[PDB]
Amino acid sequence: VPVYDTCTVPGSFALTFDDGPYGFSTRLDSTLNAANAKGSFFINGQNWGCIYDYADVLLERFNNGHFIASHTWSHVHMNQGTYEQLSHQLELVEQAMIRILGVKPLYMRPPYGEYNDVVLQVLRDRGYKGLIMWNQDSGDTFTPTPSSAQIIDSYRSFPEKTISLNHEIKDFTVDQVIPAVIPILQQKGFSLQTVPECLGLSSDPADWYVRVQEPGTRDDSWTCE
Numbered sequence: 240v241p242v243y244d245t246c247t248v249p250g251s252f253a254l255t256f257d258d259g260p261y262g263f264s265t266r267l268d269s270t271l272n273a274a275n276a277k278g279s280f281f282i283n284g285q286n287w288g289c290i291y292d293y294a295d296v297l298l299e300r301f302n303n304g305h306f307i308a309s310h311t312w313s314h315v316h317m318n319q320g321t322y323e324q325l326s327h328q329l330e331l332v333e334q335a336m337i338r339i340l341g342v343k344p345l346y347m348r349p350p351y352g353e354y355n356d357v358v359l360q361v362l363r364d365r366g367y368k369g370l371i372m373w374n375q376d377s378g379d380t381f382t383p384t385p386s387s388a389q390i391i392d393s394y395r396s397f398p399e400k401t402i403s404l405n406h407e408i409k410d411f412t413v414d415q416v417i418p419a420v421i422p423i424l425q426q427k428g429f430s431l432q433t434v435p436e437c438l439g440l441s442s443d444p445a446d447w448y449v450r451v452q453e454p455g456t457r458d459d460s461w462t463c464e
């Protein structure tokens with residue numbers, strides 16, 4: 240399983256978001272969609288909300304050509320887990336995407352950027368095609384936290400082919416940073432692409448997932464409890 244941290248397509252730029260969806264996601268996606276920009280989303284199952292409660296956002300996101308990938312179920316320190324626990328951690332997210340969207344993800348990003356040989360082996364055994372890291376950090380979860388103005392200014396110097404880490408769970412990222420930096424990056428000639436496209440893999444969204452079955456309808460199984 241390859242590890243990726245930088246784009247390869249010239250002029251490309253990957254805005255990525257961890258820990259979502261969240262109560263600001265419809266706003267974020269509206270902002271991206273209005274600019275024809277595509278985001279990359281590494282979602283949790285049960286961390287800042289139960290993924291099943293975000294089904295409507297996930298569906299809009301999925302059908303609008305944004306990249307959705309796994310961030311584990313419980314946002315675990317993956318280096319402290321056994322093969323079996325990590326497989327369960329991935330499986331539970333797969334199951335939620337199968338029920339809501341009809342598909343399994345083919346990519347993932349480890350929480351805290353922590354991974355080891357056992358993680359890569361589980362990814363390989365479970366059919367994943369890549370582990371996606373990053374090469375620039377917005378800082379939006381640093382503590383103390385940079386101001387929006389400071390984060391926006393850092394984005395003015397991120398070079399082409401950046402894979403940028405952001406977090407959907409920070410209100411100022413959705414409401415201040417991303418509305419300001421989309422024009423900065425697009426106006427200077429960068430193409431705001433998903434991670435798979437920016438890596439020269441496919442730009443067709445269907446290639447980022449495994450079709451499993453038709454999406455389900457909400458029933459009593461759509462729960463993190």
Ligand SMILES: [Zn+2]
Nearest residue numbers: 257258350351
């Ligand atoms: Zn995270």
